[PDB]
Amino acid sequence: PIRLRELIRTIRTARTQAEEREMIQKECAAIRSSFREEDNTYRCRNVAKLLYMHMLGYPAHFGQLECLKLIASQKFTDKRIGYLGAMLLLDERQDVHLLMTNCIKNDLNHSTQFVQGLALCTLGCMGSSEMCRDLAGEVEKLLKTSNSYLRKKAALCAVHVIRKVPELMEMFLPATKNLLNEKNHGVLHTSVVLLTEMCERSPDMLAHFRKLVPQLVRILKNLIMSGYSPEHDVSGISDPFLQVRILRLLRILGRNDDDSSEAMNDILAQVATNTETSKNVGNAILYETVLTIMDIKSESGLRVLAINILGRFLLNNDKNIRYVALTSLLKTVQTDHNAVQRHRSTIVDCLKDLDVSIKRRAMELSFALVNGNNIRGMMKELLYFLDSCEPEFKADCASGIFLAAEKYAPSKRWHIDTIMRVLTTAGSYVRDDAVPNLIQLITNSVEMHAYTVQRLYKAILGDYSQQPLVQVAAWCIGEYGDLLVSGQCEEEEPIQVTEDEVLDILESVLISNMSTSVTRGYALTAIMKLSTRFTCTVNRIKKVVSIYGSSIDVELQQRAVEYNALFKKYDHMRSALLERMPVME
């Protein structure tokens, strides 16, 4: 019987990874040999060693039947070891907890409180779709008990069952009725959590759960009245978890009703001024109250107080405080949007902050605060941030800029220029999915094509390694070859487009090693469409298509073969299927 402490000391004494792995394998072999004989005296030590090995990163598949056998045992230590094994190495996808349902049912009616509490905790931690179905009745039976130490466990089990089985919440409607007068803080917190979970799961109980708003307000006022707490009072805040739960319930209760907001308006006003945010608990309580006020139909004074609190917390030098303020501002973007414009300087400064989370929050706030009047002004700031942004934020910044241009672009020409600049500067940071959106936007716009075509031609000849920019340029060329070059049928004066540079660029892109088979297909389609779109360069792309028909790629080879067949046998019918594609939103 190797003790857990001895195994830990042996593991710590190993230095090399191979030696530690060998020691773990030897310990697992010894444990398996002991379990194969059906040992029950030193089962706790073997279970502890197996759990330690599993936590270190060792396989524990063979240590599954032993945990199940120890679960149905009678020893308190053996029962605890089995419960720990079921919670740690037992999961819904494991499939070994199916036989544990009988053990849980047998232990659900156990007289000992530790066994019943441990079983309830294990069921809540490892809640399954089928385990809850056969254990829903047992959970509801314990919900009506008067045990303060077991009331919280029953509430947690009911919440876990509701989360795993949303259709089982109908049986908990009468079990939690008349449970707002619990003296114990834990029982009251469990009841509040269960009520909030029921309200969030379905809105049918919102009206039924909204009648207890005066009781919750009275409880919150009574808790606030006693500013000290021998139990649960940490950092000068008594029952911070209870206060947070009450604030969350108030924010989620009556979010679209005036009576609920009016009833809790006085409580929110008292909390917003009777709470000190010097400590972390006070700051969290203030943030929760501000979020509840913003998410509910509160008064103008409450909204002003929440905005002032958010602004004060924004100037706090604490990284956590700054992140909380940024999150609150982002959440209160649509609501109190005009009042959020006063923090434009703070949002801009947060982009240059030395915190990754703070910088991300500032960027999100700036993106969400872009309107139809500050979009033009904020475009330069967004471009500067994207140019000098982190590698993980350059793609996000480019996506946000593109979304702002497509949603609140001041003009098509300005939006087109911004998109072209983003494509040129984004390079490999432009998402491939945004390429279809850019193509659709270009196709929809039929007023700015000559300038856009010229810009695409200029950006294509300089560089071709950018997959999104290259694809956009190829699509633009295929769509507006007739407008990119004017009077290019024969030799003319030296212009930007001579009817031969585009074909050479397309051939280089198709034959260039920097092709992912997607831009090559777009280039081939553009070249095929240019046979009818452009009448200057003719009789030359047919040879390339015929040669390109033997490509290594099956799809590319088939496309080349089809293009060659169309050029050699459907020359008169080439223009019959080269019509412009329809433009739709």
Partner: protein, 415 residues
Amino acid sequence: SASAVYVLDLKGKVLICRNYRGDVDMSEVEHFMPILMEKEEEGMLSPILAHGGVRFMWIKHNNLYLVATSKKNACVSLVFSFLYKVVQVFSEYFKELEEESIRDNFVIIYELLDELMDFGYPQTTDSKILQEYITQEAPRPPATVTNAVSWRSEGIKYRKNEVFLDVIEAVNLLVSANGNVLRSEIVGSIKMRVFLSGMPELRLGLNDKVLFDNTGRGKSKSVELEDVKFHQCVRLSRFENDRTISFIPPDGEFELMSYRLNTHVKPLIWIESVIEKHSHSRIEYMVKAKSQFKRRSTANNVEIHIPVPNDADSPKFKTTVGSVKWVPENSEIVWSVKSFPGGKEYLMRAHFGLPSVEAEDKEGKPPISVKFEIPYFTTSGIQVRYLKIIEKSGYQALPWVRYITQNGDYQLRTQ
């Protein structure tokens, strides 16, 4: 052309570093550990690392990674040879290759590193020569390094001139799961521990097939090594001219010649394995070993390693000859036999249970390898003719040599 050769540790700490060219910053060693960790986690780890424009070639040592950072397109083979020479010198000077000796002989280690190479070009590579000029417990450099004979120090005097040779034979057999041997190559090893007085020039002579054909005696048993590599002291000119193995023997144990040719004979030990593995119920090990070697030769310390199941437990061994021990660390059962006479037939019947829960991922089928080693056996049949020991002073030498046959890459593919 490595910029600087340094010795790392298992935790990424550099035990000792010595820049040779100065073109690579010493701070690049810190990024070597993250690069190695990323390569290992993605399967792209290689001995020759690449940190931007500077390549950090590292060799997995006993306890530290001998990382030799380089900047230009230096000779990778030359860098590897220099690293191997440095490792050999460290092993000769220090019996242990770990962090205990890295930080215990720094005063002499720095001097040895400085004297070994300068400006990225190694200069001193003889362990005896290095020890004769740099010691951990200084005179002018020895004339042996400057002289042509850098592998035989002059002036050595001994009471008796005795040389102990070792005919090391490595029997490597690559038997696939189908029962056929794919890679069956035997690599010879002629290593002699010469301990005499002076600098005698050994005149190696054996029953070589090429030599017998050249001399007209190509009718008896002659060893035809496909690849023959001479030692550093061995003169390549004589061997290319008329196969004359004439060279000055070194002071101590050294490898003069190492034959390497394919083997077309039957394996010395024929091992057949039977896997009566039930579906999560039990496992059967029908391992039968047949001695294909001569009955007059006994395979001492024969250990036929049979890989058992990874999750197998409670195993029972039912064999006839040889003790069978299951090592959980190795995850296999080795059929260890103290003495294995030729022609012996050992049958074993393993039986062990398996866990009810099936394994989440497969563990593979490692090949079964044996550790048979039968000394005084010459499978190749090559017999040494004579050893021409000539000294300027004139003495009667009494060279000795022993033939040892062992199992090298004798791995049998699992079913």
